[PDB]
Amino acid sequence: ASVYAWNRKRISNCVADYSVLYNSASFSTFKCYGVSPTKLNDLCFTNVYA
Amino acid sequence: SALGKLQDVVNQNAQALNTLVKQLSSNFGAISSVLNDILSRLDKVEAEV
């Protein structure tokens, strides 16, 4: 998206592997707040909004 | 109503303990009041603070 018209994608009712994300050296930046990326795989969430 | 001098000793210990126990719910500037949340959300280098 254009940044004032920013996109939001709802994620719900599914399983994921965040190591597929944090291992991906293509990301020129990767940071986390209130959670550690290496600890994401033990969690579950209400929904997620990307 | 005559037994106030004894009842007060039970009441003051309950007021102290049900404050000491309830302070486990306080955040103190951390990410959660419950310790297992931090340990299950953060790696130890972030968790130690």
Side-chain angles (χ1 to χ4, degrees):
Chain A
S2 295
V3 66
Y4 57 84
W6 47 266
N7 170 54
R8 172 164 289 189
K9 185 71 165 182
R10 184 176 177 213
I11 306 295
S12 77
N13 310 82
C14 65
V15 293
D17 179 0
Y18 302 89
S19 73
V20 183
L21 308 183
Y22 70 72
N23 295 341
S24 189
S26 62
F27 297 126
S28 314
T29 288
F30 203 122
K31 295 292 180 178
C32 299
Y33 308 99
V35 175
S36 173
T38 33
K39 185 51 58 174
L40 284 166
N41 277 358
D42 292 333
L43 297 176
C44 302
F45 315 94
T46 312
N47 314 264
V48 170
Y49 292 91
Chain B
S1 63
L3 294 89
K5 289 182 176 178
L6 305 177
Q7 188 58 46
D8 188 18
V9 175
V10 178
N11 292 354
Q12 286 184 40
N13 284 285
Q15 291 160 15
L17 278 161
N18 292 354
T19 302
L20 176 67
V21 173
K22 192 169 186 177
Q23 282 287 68
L24 294 169
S25 70
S26 297
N27 295 303
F28 303 99
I31 188 63
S32 177
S33 61
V34 177
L35 185 69
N36 301 358
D37 302 348
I38 303 102
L39 296 168
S40 61
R41 288 161 67 161
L42 303 185
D43 288 63
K44 291 191 300 184
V45 172
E46 298 283 54
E48 279 175 14
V49 170

Coordinates of all heavy atoms in Angstrom, one line a residue:
Chain A
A1 N 0.8 -1.2 0.0 CA 0.0 0.0 0.0 C 0.8 1.3 0.0 O 1.9 1.4 0.5 CB -0.9 0.0 1.2
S2 N 0.2 2.4 -0.5 CA 0.5 3.8 -0.2 C 0.3 4.0 1.3 O -0.6 3.6 1.9 CB -0.4 4.7 -1.0 OG -0.1 4.6 -2.4
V3 N 1.3 4.7 1.9 CA 1.5 4.6 3.4 C 0.4 5.2 4.3 O 0.2 4.7 5.4 CB 2.9 5.0 3.7 CG1 3.1 6.5 3.5 CG2 3.3 4.6 5.2
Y4 N -0.3 6.3 3.8 CA -1.4 6.8 4.5 C -2.7 5.9 4.3 O -3.5 5.8 5.3 CB -1.7 8.2 4.1 CG -1.9 8.4 2.6 CD1 -3.2 8.2 2.1 CD2 -0.9 8.8 1.8 CE1 -3.4 8.3 0.7 CE2 -1.1 8.9 0.4 CZ -2.4 8.7 -0.2 OH -2.5 8.8 -1.5
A5 N -2.8 5.3 3.2 CA -3.8 4.3 2.9 C -3.4 2.9 3.2 O -3.7 1.9 2.5 CB -4.2 4.5 1.4
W6 N -2.7 2.7 4.3 CA -1.9 1.5 4.7 C -2.8 0.2 4.6 O -4.0 0.2 5.0 CB -1.2 1.6 6.0 CG -2.1 2.2 7.1 CD1 -2.1 3.6 7.4 CD2 -3.0 1.6 8.1 NE1 -3.0 3.8 8.5 CE2 -3.5 2.6 8.9 CE3 -3.4 0.2 8.3 CZ2 -4.3 2.3 10.0 CZ3 -4.2 -0.1 9.4 CH2 -4.7 0.9 10.2
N7 N -2.3 -0.9 4.2 CA -3.0 -2.2 4.1 C -3.0 -2.8 5.5 O -2.0 -2.8 6.2 CB -2.3 -3.1 3.1 CG -2.8 -4.5 3.1 OD1 -3.9 -4.8 3.1 ND2 -1.9 -5.5 3.3
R8 N -4.1 -3.5 5.9 CA -4.2 -4.5 7.0 C -4.8 -5.8 6.5 O -5.9 -5.8 6.0 CB -4.9 -3.8 8.1 CG -5.2 -4.8 9.3 CD -5.7 -4.1 10.6 NE -4.5 -3.4 11.2 CZ -4.4 -2.8 12.3 NH1 -5.3 -2.8 13.2 NH2 -3.2 -2.3 12.6
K9 N -4.1 -6.9 6.7 CA -4.5 -8.3 6.4 C -4.8 -9.0 7.7 O -3.9 -9.2 8.6 CB -3.4 -8.9 5.6 CG -3.7 -10.3 5.0 CD -4.7 -10.3 3.9 CE -4.6 -11.7 3.2 NZ -5.6 -11.7 2.0
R10 N -6.0 -9.5 8.0 CA -6.4 -10.3 9.1 C -5.9 -11.7 8.9 O -6.2 -12.3 7.9 CB -7.9 -10.2 9.4 CG -8.3 -11.0 10.6 CD -9.8 -10.9 10.9 NE -10.2 -11.6 12.1 CZ -11.4 -12.2 12.2 NH1 -12.4 -12.2 11.4 NH2 -11.6 -12.9 13.3
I11 N -5.3 -12.3 9.9 CA -4.9 -13.7 10.0 C -5.6 -14.3 11.2 O -5.6 -13.8 12.3 CB -3.4 -13.8 10.2 CG1 -2.5 -13.1 9.1 CG2 -3.0 -15.3 10.3 CD1 -2.7 -13.7 7.7
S12 N -6.4 -15.4 11.0 CA -7.1 -16.1 12.1 C -7.3 -17.6 11.7 O -7.2 -18.0 10.6 CB -8.4 -15.4 12.4 OG -9.4 -15.7 11.5
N13 N -7.6 -18.4 12.7 CA -8.0 -19.8 12.6 C -7.0 -20.7 11.8 O -7.4 -21.4 10.8 CB -9.4 -19.9 12.1 CG -10.4 -19.0 12.9 OD1 -10.5 -17.8 12.6 ND2 -11.1 -19.6 13.8
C14 N -5.7 -20.6 12.1 CA -4.6 -21.2 11.3 C -3.3 -21.5 12.1 O -3.2 -21.0 13.2 CB -4.4 -20.4 10.0 SG -3.8 -18.7 10.4
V15 N -2.4 -22.2 11.5 CA -1.1 -22.5 12.1 C 0.1 -21.9 11.2 O -0.1 -21.8 10.0 CB -0.8 -24.0 12.3 CG1 -1.7 -24.5 13.4 CG2 -1.0 -24.8 11.1
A16 N 1.1 -21.4 11.8 CA 2.3 -20.8 11.1 C 3.6 -21.2 11.7 O 3.7 -21.8 12.8 CB 2.1 -19.2 11.3
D17 N 4.7 -20.9 11.0 CA 6.1 -21.1 11.5 C 6.9 -19.8 11.2 O 7.4 -19.5 10.1 CB 6.7 -22.3 10.8 CG 8.2 -22.5 11.3 OD1 8.7 -21.7 12.1 OD2 8.8 -23.5 10.8
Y18 N 7.1 -19.0 12.3 CA 7.8 -17.8 12.2 C 9.3 -17.9 12.1 O 10.0 -17.0 11.7 CB 7.4 -17.0 13.5 CG 6.0 -16.8 13.6 CD1 5.1 -17.7 14.3 CD2 5.4 -15.6 13.1 CE1 3.7 -17.5 14.4 CE2 4.0 -15.5 13.1 CZ 3.2 -16.4 13.8 OH 1.8 -16.2 13.8
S19 N 9.9 -19.1 12.3 CA 11.3 -19.3 11.9 C 11.5 -19.2 10.4 O 12.5 -18.7 9.9 CB 11.8 -20.7 12.4 OG 11.2 -21.7 11.6
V20 N 10.5 -19.5 9.6 CA 10.5 -19.3 8.1 C 10.7 -17.8 7.8 O 11.4 -17.5 6.8 CB 9.2 -19.8 7.5 CG1 9.2 -19.7 5.9 CG2 9.0 -21.3 7.8
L21 N 10.2 -16.9 8.7 CA 10.4 -15.5 8.5 C 11.7 -15.1 9.1 O 12.5 -14.5 8.3 CB 9.2 -14.7 9.2 CG 7.8 -15.2 8.8 CD1 6.8 -14.3 9.5 CD2 7.6 -15.0 7.3
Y22 N 12.0 -15.3 10.4 CA 13.3 -14.8 11.0 C 14.6 -15.4 10.4 O 15.6 -14.8 10.5 CB 13.2 -14.8 12.5 CG 13.2 -16.1 13.2 CD1 14.4 -16.8 13.3 CD2 12.1 -16.5 14.0 CE1 14.5 -18.0 14.0 CE2 12.2 -17.7 14.7 CZ 13.3 -18.5 14.7 OH 13.4 -19.7 15.4
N23 N 14.5 -16.6 9.8 CA 15.6 -17.2 9.1 C 15.8 -16.5 7.7 O 16.9 -16.7 7.1 CB 15.5 -18.7 8.9 CG 15.5 -19.5 10.2 OD1 16.0 -19.0 11.2 ND2 15.0 -20.7 10.2
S24 N 14.9 -15.8 7.1 CA 14.9 -15.2 5.8 C 15.8 -14.0 5.7 O 15.4 -12.9 5.9 CB 13.5 -14.9 5.3 OG 13.5 -14.6 3.9
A25 N 17.1 -14.2 5.3 CA 18.1 -13.2 5.1 C 17.7 -12.1 4.1 O 18.4 -11.0 4.1 CB 19.4 -13.9 4.8
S26 N 16.7 -12.2 3.3 CA 16.2 -11.2 2.4 C 15.7 -10.0 3.2 O 15.7 -8.9 2.7 CB 15.0 -11.8 1.6 OG 13.9 -12.2 2.5
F27 N 15.2 -10.1 4.5 CA 14.8 -9.0 5.3 C 15.9 -8.1 5.7 O 16.7 -8.4 6.6 CB 13.9 -9.5 6.5 CG 12.7 -10.2 6.0 CD1 12.4 -11.5 6.5 CD2 11.7 -9.6 5.2 CE1 11.2 -12.2 6.1 CE2 10.6 -10.2 4.8 CZ 10.3 -11.5 5.3
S28 N 16.0 -6.9 5.1 CA 16.9 -5.8 5.4 C 16.7 -5.2 6.8 O 17.6 -4.6 7.3 CB 16.8 -4.6 4.4 OG 16.7 -5.1 3.1
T29 N 15.6 -5.5 7.4 CA 15.4 -5.2 8.9 C 14.3 -6.2 9.4 O 13.4 -6.5 8.8 CB 14.9 -3.8 9.1 OG1 16.0 -2.9 8.9 CG2 14.4 -3.4 10.5
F30 N 14.5 -6.7 10.7 CA 13.6 -7.5 11.4 C 13.8 -7.2 12.9 O 14.9 -7.4 13.4 CB 14.0 -9.0 11.1 CG 12.8 -10.0 11.3 CD1 12.4 -10.8 10.2 CD2 12.2 -10.2 12.5 CE1 11.4 -11.7 10.3 CE2 11.2 -11.1 12.7 CZ 10.8 -11.9 11.6
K31 N 12.7 -6.8 13.5 CA 12.7 -6.4 14.9 C 11.4 -6.8 15.6 O 10.4 -6.8 14.9 CB 12.9 -4.8 15.1 CG 14.2 -4.3 14.6 CD 15.4 -4.7 15.5 CE 16.7 -4.1 15.0 NZ 17.8 -4.5 15.8
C32 N 11.4 -7.0 16.9 CA 10.2 -7.4 17.7 C 10.1 -6.7 19.0 O 11.2 -6.4 19.6 CB 10.2 -8.9 17.8 SG 10.1 -9.9 16.3
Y33 N 8.9 -6.5 19.5 CA 8.6 -5.8 20.7 C 7.6 -6.5 21.5 O 6.6 -7.1 20.9 CB 8.1 -4.4 20.3 CG 9.0 -3.7 19.3 CD1 8.8 -3.7 17.9 CD2 10.2 -3.0 19.8 CE1 9.7 -3.1 17.0 CE2 11.1 -2.4 18.9 CZ 10.9 -2.5 17.5 OH 11.8 -1.9 16.6
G34 N 7.8 -6.6 22.8 CA 6.9 -7.5 23.7 C 7.0 -9.0 23.5 O 6.4 -9.7 24.2
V35 N 7.7 -9.4 22.4 CA 8.0 -10.8 22.0 C 9.4 -10.9 21.4 O 9.9 -9.9 20.8 CB 6.9 -11.4 21.1 CG1 7.3 -12.8 20.6 CG2 5.6 -11.5 21.7
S36 N 10.1 -12.0 21.5 CA 11.4 -12.3 20.8 C 11.1 -13.2 19.6 O 10.4 -14.2 19.7 CB 12.3 -13.0 21.7 OG 13.5 -13.4 21.0
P37 N 11.7 -12.9 18.4 CA 11.4 -13.7 17.2 C 11.7 -15.2 17.4 O 10.8 -16.0 17.1 CB 12.2 -13.1 16.1 CG 13.4 -12.4 16.8 CD 12.7 -12.0 18.1
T38 N 12.8 -15.5 18.0 CA 13.2 -16.9 18.3 C 12.2 -17.6 19.3 O 12.3 -18.9 19.4 CB 14.6 -16.9 18.9 OG1 14.9 -15.8 19.7 CG2 15.6 -17.0 17.8
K39 N 11.3 -16.9 20.0 CA 10.3 -17.5 20.9 C 8.9 -17.5 20.3 O 8.0 -18.1 20.8 CB 10.5 -16.7 22.2 CG 9.6 -17.1 23.4 CD 9.6 -18.6 23.7 CE 11.0 -19.2 24.0 NZ 10.9 -20.6 24.5
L40 N 8.7 -16.8 19.1 CA 7.4 -16.8 18.4 C 6.7 -18.2 18.3 O 5.5 -18.3 18.5 CB 7.5 -16.2 17.0 CG 7.7 -14.7 17.0 CD1 8.2 -14.2 15.7 CD2 6.4 -14.0 17.3
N41 N 7.5 -19.2 17.9 CA 7.0 -20.5 17.6 C 6.3 -21.2 18.8 O 5.5 -22.1 18.5 CB 8.1 -21.3 16.9 CG 8.3 -21.1 15.4 OD1 7.5 -20.3 14.8 ND2 9.2 -21.7 14.8
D42 N 6.5 -20.9 20.0 CA 5.8 -21.4 21.2 C 4.4 -20.8 21.4 O 3.7 -21.3 22.3 CB 6.7 -21.3 22.4 CG 7.9 -22.3 22.4 OD1 7.9 -23.3 21.7 OD2 8.9 -21.9 23.1
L43 N 4.1 -19.7 20.8 CA 2.9 -18.9 21.1 C 1.6 -19.3 20.3 O 1.7 -19.9 19.3 CB 3.2 -17.4 20.9 CG 4.4 -16.8 21.8 CD1 4.7 -15.4 21.4 CD2 3.9 -16.9 23.3
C44 N 0.5 -18.8 20.8 CA -0.7 -18.6 20.0 C -1.3 -17.2 20.3 O -0.9 -16.5 21.3 CB -1.8 -19.6 20.3 SG -1.3 -21.4 20.0
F45 N -2.2 -16.7 19.5 CA -2.7 -15.3 19.5 C -4.2 -15.3 19.2 O -4.7 -16.3 18.6 CB -2.0 -14.5 18.5 CG -0.5 -14.6 18.5 CD1 0.2 -15.5 17.6 CD2 0.3 -13.8 19.4 CE1 1.6 -15.6 17.6 CE2 1.7 -14.0 19.3 CZ 2.3 -14.9 18.4
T46 N -4.9 -14.3 19.6 CA -6.4 -14.2 19.4 C -6.7 -14.2 17.9 O -7.1 -15.2 17.4 CB -7.0 -12.9 20.1 OG1 -6.5 -12.8 21.4 CG2 -8.5 -12.9 20.1
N47 N -6.4 -13.1 17.2 CA -6.0 -13.1 15.8 C -4.6 -12.6 15.7 O -3.9 -12.4 16.7 CB -7.0 -12.1 15.1 CG -8.4 -12.2 15.4 OD1 -9.2 -12.9 14.7 ND2 -8.9 -11.5 16.5
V48 N -4.1 -12.4 14.4 CA -2.9 -11.6 14.1 C -3.4 -10.6 13.1 O -4.1 -10.9 12.2 CB -1.7 -12.4 13.7 CG1 -0.6 -11.5 13.2 CG2 -1.2 -13.2 14.9
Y49 N -2.9 -9.3 13.1 CA -3.1 -8.4 12.0 C -1.8 -8.0 11.4 O -0.9 -7.4 12.1 CB -3.9 -7.2 12.6 CG -5.3 -7.5 12.9 CD1 -5.6 -7.9 14.2 CD2 -6.3 -7.5 11.9 CE1 -6.9 -8.4 14.5 CE2 -7.6 -7.9 12.2 CZ -7.9 -8.4 13.5 OH -9.2 -8.8 13.8
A50 N -1.6 -8.4 10.1 CA -0.4 -8.0 9.4 C -0.7 -6.7 8.6 O -1.4 -6.8 7.6 CB 0.0 -9.2 8.5
Chain B
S1 N -19.7 -7.7 69.5 CA -19.0 -6.4 69.6 C -18.0 -6.2 70.7 O -17.1 -5.4 70.6 CB -20.1 -5.3 69.6 OG -20.9 -5.4 70.8
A2 N -18.1 -7.0 71.8 CA -17.2 -7.0 72.9 C -15.8 -7.5 72.5 O -14.8 -7.0 73.1 CB -17.8 -7.9 74.0
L3 N -15.6 -8.4 71.5 CA -14.4 -9.1 71.2 C -13.4 -8.3 70.3 O -12.5 -8.8 69.7 CB -14.6 -10.5 70.7 CG -15.2 -11.4 71.8 CD1 -16.8 -11.4 71.8 CD2 -14.8 -12.9 71.4
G4 N -13.7 -7.0 70.1 CA -12.9 -6.2 69.1 C -11.4 -6.3 69.2 O -10.8 -6.5 68.2
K5 N -10.9 -6.4 70.4 CA -9.4 -6.5 70.6 C -8.8 -7.7 70.1 O -7.6 -7.7 69.7 CB -9.1 -6.4 72.2 CG -9.3 -5.0 72.7 CD -9.0 -4.9 74.2 CE -9.1 -3.5 74.7 NZ -8.8 -3.3 76.1
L6 N -9.5 -8.8 69.9 CA -9.0 -10.1 69.3 C -9.4 -10.0 67.8 O -8.5 -10.3 67.0 CB -9.6 -11.3 69.9 CG -9.4 -11.5 71.4 CD1 -10.1 -12.7 71.9 CD2 -8.0 -11.5 71.8
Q7 N -10.6 -9.6 67.4 CA -11.0 -9.6 66.0 C -10.1 -8.7 65.1 O -9.7 -9.1 64.0 CB -12.5 -9.2 65.9 CG -13.0 -9.4 64.5 CD -12.9 -10.8 64.0 OE1 -13.2 -11.7 64.7 NE2 -12.4 -11.0 62.8
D8 N -9.7 -7.6 65.7 CA -8.7 -6.7 65.1 C -7.4 -7.4 64.7 O -6.8 -7.1 63.7 CB -8.5 -5.5 66.1 CG -7.7 -4.3 65.5 OD1 -7.5 -4.2 64.3 OD2 -7.3 -3.5 66.4
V9 N -6.9 -8.3 65.5 CA -5.6 -9.0 65.3 C -5.8 -9.9 64.1 O -4.9 -10.0 63.2 CB -5.1 -9.7 66.5 CG1 -3.9 -10.6 66.2 CG2 -4.7 -8.7 67.5
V10 N -6.9 -10.6 63.9 CA -7.2 -11.4 62.7 C -7.3 -10.5 61.5 O -6.7 -10.7 60.5 CB -8.4 -12.3 62.9 CG1 -8.7 -13.1 61.6 CG2 -8.2 -13.3 64.0
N11 N -8.1 -9.4 61.6 CA -8.4 -8.5 60.5 C -7.1 -7.9 60.0 O -6.8 -7.8 58.8 CB -9.4 -7.4 60.9 CG -10.8 -7.9 61.2 OD1 -11.1 -9.1 61.0 ND2 -11.6 -7.0 61.6
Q12 N -6.2 -7.4 60.9 CA -4.9 -6.8 60.4 C -4.0 -7.7 59.7 O -3.3 -7.3 58.7 CB -4.2 -6.1 61.6 CG -4.9 -4.8 62.1 CD -4.1 -4.1 63.2 OE1 -2.9 -4.1 63.2 NE2 -4.8 -3.6 64.1
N13 N -3.9 -9.0 60.1 CA -3.1 -10.0 59.4 C -3.8 -10.3 58.0 O -3.0 -10.4 57.0 CB -2.9 -11.2 60.2 CG -1.8 -11.0 61.3 OD1 -0.7 -10.9 60.9 ND2 -2.2 -10.7 62.5
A14 N -5.1 -10.4 57.9 CA -5.8 -10.6 56.6 C -5.6 -9.4 55.7 O -5.2 -9.5 54.5 CB -7.2 -10.9 56.9
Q15 N -5.7 -8.1 56.2 CA -5.4 -6.9 55.4 C -4.0 -6.9 54.9 O -3.7 -6.5 53.8 CB -5.6 -5.7 56.3 CG -7.1 -5.4 56.6 CD -7.3 -4.5 57.8 OE1 -6.4 -3.8 58.3 NE2 -8.4 -4.4 58.4
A16 N -3.0 -7.3 55.7 CA -1.6 -7.4 55.3 C -1.4 -8.5 54.2 O -0.9 -8.2 53.1 CB -0.7 -7.6 56.5
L17 N -1.8 -9.7 54.5 CA -1.6 -10.8 53.5 C -2.4 -10.6 52.2 O -1.8 -10.7 51.2 CB -2.0 -12.2 54.2 CG -0.9 -12.7 55.0 CD1 -1.4 -13.8 56.0 CD2 0.2 -13.4 54.1
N18 N -3.7 -10.2 52.3 CA -4.4 -9.9 51.0 C -4.0 -8.6 50.4 O -4.6 -8.2 49.4 CB -5.9 -10.1 51.3 CG -6.3 -11.5 51.5 OD1 -5.6 -12.4 51.4 ND2 -7.6 -11.7 51.8
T19 N -3.0 -7.9 50.9 CA -2.2 -6.9 50.1 C -0.9 -7.5 49.6 O -0.7 -7.4 48.4 CB -1.9 -5.6 51.0 OG1 -3.1 -5.1 51.4 CG2 -1.2 -4.6 50.2
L20 N -0.2 -8.2 50.4 CA 1.1 -8.9 49.9 C 0.8 -9.8 48.7 O 1.6 -9.8 47.8 CB 1.7 -9.6 51.1 CG 3.0 -10.4 50.7 CD1 4.1 -9.5 50.3 CD2 3.5 -11.3 51.9
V21 N -0.2 -10.6 48.8 CA -0.6 -11.6 47.7 C -1.1 -10.8 46.5 O -0.7 -11.0 45.4 CB -1.6 -12.6 48.2 CG1 -2.2 -13.4 47.1 CG2 -1.0 -13.5 49.2
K22 N -2.0 -9.8 46.7 CA -2.5 -9.0 45.6 C -1.4 -8.2 44.9 O -1.5 -8.1 43.7 CB -3.6 -8.1 46.1 CG -4.4 -7.5 45.0 CD -5.7 -6.8 45.4 CE -6.5 -6.3 44.2 NZ -7.8 -5.7 44.6
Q23 N -0.3 -7.8 45.6 CA 0.8 -7.1 44.9 C 1.5 -8.0 43.9 O 2.2 -7.5 43.0 CB 1.8 -6.6 45.9 CG 1.4 -5.3 46.5 CD 1.5 -4.1 45.6 OE1 0.8 -4.0 44.6 NE2 2.4 -3.1 45.8
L24 N 1.3 -9.4 43.9 CA 1.8 -10.2 42.8 C 1.1 -9.8 41.4 O 1.7 -10.1 40.4 CB 1.5 -11.7 43.1 CG 2.3 -12.2 44.3 CD1 1.7 -13.6 44.7 CD2 3.7 -12.4 43.9
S25 N -0.1 -9.2 41.4 CA -0.7 -8.8 40.2 C -0.2 -7.5 39.6 O -0.6 -7.1 38.6 CB -2.2 -8.6 40.5 OG -2.5 -7.5 41.3
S26 N 0.8 -6.8 40.3 CA 1.3 -5.5 39.9 C 2.4 -5.6 38.9 O 3.2 -6.5 39.0 CB 1.7 -4.7 41.1 OG 0.5 -4.4 41.9
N27 N 2.5 -4.7 37.9 CA 3.4 -4.8 36.8 C 4.8 -4.2 37.1 O 5.8 -4.6 36.5 CB 2.8 -4.0 35.6 CG 1.6 -4.7 35.1 OD1 1.6 -5.9 34.7 ND2 0.5 -4.1 35.0
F28 N 4.9 -3.2 38.0 CA 6.2 -2.6 38.4 C 7.0 -2.0 37.2 O 8.3 -1.9 37.3 CB 7.0 -3.5 39.3 CG 6.3 -3.9 40.6 CD1 5.7 -5.2 40.6 CD2 6.3 -3.1 41.7 CE1 5.1 -5.6 41.8 CE2 5.7 -3.5 42.9 CZ 5.1 -4.7 43.0
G29 N 6.4 -1.7 36.1 CA 7.1 -1.3 34.8 C 7.7 -2.5 34.0 O 8.4 -2.2 33.1
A30 N 7.3 -3.7 34.2 CA 7.6 -4.9 33.4 C 6.4 -5.1 32.4 O 5.3 -4.6 32.5 CB 7.8 -6.1 34.2
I31 N 6.7 -6.0 31.4 CA 5.7 -6.4 30.3 C 4.5 -7.2 30.8 O 3.5 -7.1 30.2 CB 6.5 -7.1 29.2 CG1 5.7 -7.4 27.9 CG2 7.1 -8.4 29.7 CD1 5.2 -6.1 27.2
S32 N 4.6 -7.9 32.0 CA 3.4 -8.6 32.6 C 3.6 -8.7 34.1 O 4.7 -8.7 34.6 CB 3.2 -10.0 32.0 OG 2.2 -10.6 32.6
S33 N 2.5 -8.9 34.9 CA 2.5 -9.2 36.3 C 2.9 -10.7 36.6 O 3.3 -11.0 37.7 CB 1.2 -9.0 36.9 OG 0.2 -9.8 36.2
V34 N 2.7 -11.6 35.6 CA 2.9 -13.0 35.8 C 4.2 -13.5 35.1 O 4.3 -13.4 33.9 CB 1.7 -13.8 35.3 CG1 1.9 -15.4 35.4 CG2 0.5 -13.5 36.1
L35 N 5.1 -14.1 35.9 CA 6.5 -14.3 35.4 C 6.7 -15.2 34.2 O 7.5 -15.0 33.4 CB 7.3 -14.8 36.7 CG 8.8 -15.0 36.4 CD1 9.5 -13.6 36.3 CD2 9.4 -15.7 37.6
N36 N 5.8 -16.2 34.2 CA 5.9 -17.2 33.1 C 5.6 -16.6 31.7 O 6.1 -17.0 30.7 CB 4.8 -18.3 33.4 CG 5.1 -19.1 34.6 OD1 6.0 -18.8 35.4 ND2 4.2 -20.0 35.0
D37 N 4.8 -15.5 31.6 CA 4.6 -14.7 30.4 C 5.9 -14.2 29.8 O 6.2 -14.5 28.6 CB 3.7 -13.6 30.6 CG 2.3 -13.9 31.2 OD1 1.9 -15.1 31.2 OD2 1.6 -12.9 31.5
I38 N 6.7 -13.6 30.6 CA 8.0 -13.0 30.2 C 8.9 -14.1 29.7 O 9.4 -14.1 28.5 CB 8.7 -12.2 31.3 CG1 7.8 -11.1 31.9 CG2 10.0 -11.6 30.9 CD1 7.1 -11.5 33.2
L39 N 9.0 -15.2 30.4 CA 9.9 -16.3 30.1 C 9.4 -17.1 28.9 O 10.2 -17.7 28.2 CB 9.9 -17.3 31.3 CG 10.6 -16.6 32.6 CD1 10.3 -17.5 33.8 CD2 12.1 -16.5 32.4
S40 N 8.1 -17.0 28.5 CA 7.5 -17.6 27.3 C 7.3 -16.7 26.2 O 6.9 -17.1 25.1 CB 6.2 -18.4 27.7 OG 5.3 -17.5 28.2
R41 N 7.7 -15.4 26.3 CA 7.6 -14.4 25.2 C 9.0 -13.9 24.8 O 9.2 -13.5 23.7 CB 6.8 -13.2 25.7 CG 5.3 -13.5 25.7 CD 4.5 -12.5 26.6 NE 4.4 -11.2 26.0 CZ 3.5 -10.2 26.3 NH1 2.6 -10.4 27.1 NH2 3.6 -9.1 25.7
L42 N 10.0 -13.9 25.7 CA 11.3 -13.3 25.5 C 12.5 -14.3 25.6 O 12.4 -15.2 26.5 CB 11.5 -12.1 26.5 CG 10.4 -11.0 26.4 CD1 10.9 -9.9 27.4 CD2 10.3 -10.4 25.0
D43 N 13.5 -14.1 24.8 CA 14.8 -14.7 25.1 C 15.6 -14.0 26.3 O 15.3 -12.8 26.5 CB 15.7 -14.8 23.9 CG 15.3 -15.7 22.8 OD1 14.2 -15.6 22.2 OD2 16.1 -16.6 22.4
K44 N 16.4 -14.7 27.0 CA 16.9 -14.3 28.3 C 17.6 -12.9 28.4 O 17.4 -12.2 29.3 CB 17.7 -15.4 29.0 CG 16.9 -16.6 29.4 CD 17.6 -17.6 30.3 CE 18.9 -18.2 29.6 NZ 19.5 -19.2 30.4
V45 N 18.3 -12.6 27.3 CA 19.0 -11.3 27.2 C 18.0 -10.1 27.2 O 18.3 -9.1 27.8 CB 19.9 -11.2 26.0 CG1 20.5 -9.9 25.6 CG2 21.1 -12.2 26.1
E46 N 16.8 -10.3 26.6 CA 15.7 -9.3 26.8 C 15.0 -9.5 28.1 O 14.6 -8.5 28.7 CB 14.7 -9.5 25.6 CG 15.3 -9.3 24.2 CD 15.4 -7.8 23.9 OE1 16.0 -7.0 24.6 OE2 14.8 -7.3 22.8
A47 N 14.8 -10.7 28.6 CA 14.0 -11.0 29.7 C 14.6 -10.5 31.0 O 13.9 -10.1 31.9 CB 13.7 -12.5 29.8
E48 N 15.9 -10.5 31.2 CA 16.6 -10.1 32.4 C 16.2 -8.7 32.9 O 16.0 -8.5 34.1 CB 18.1 -10.3 32.3 CG 18.6 -11.7 32.5 CD 20.1 -11.9 32.2 OE1 20.9 -10.9 32.1 OE2 20.5 -13.1 32.1
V49 N 16.0 -7.8 32.0 CA 15.6 -6.4 32.4 C 14.2 -6.5 33.0 O 13.9 -5.9 34.0 CB 15.6 -5.4 31.2 CG1 15.0 -4.1 31.5 CG2 17.1 -5.2 30.9

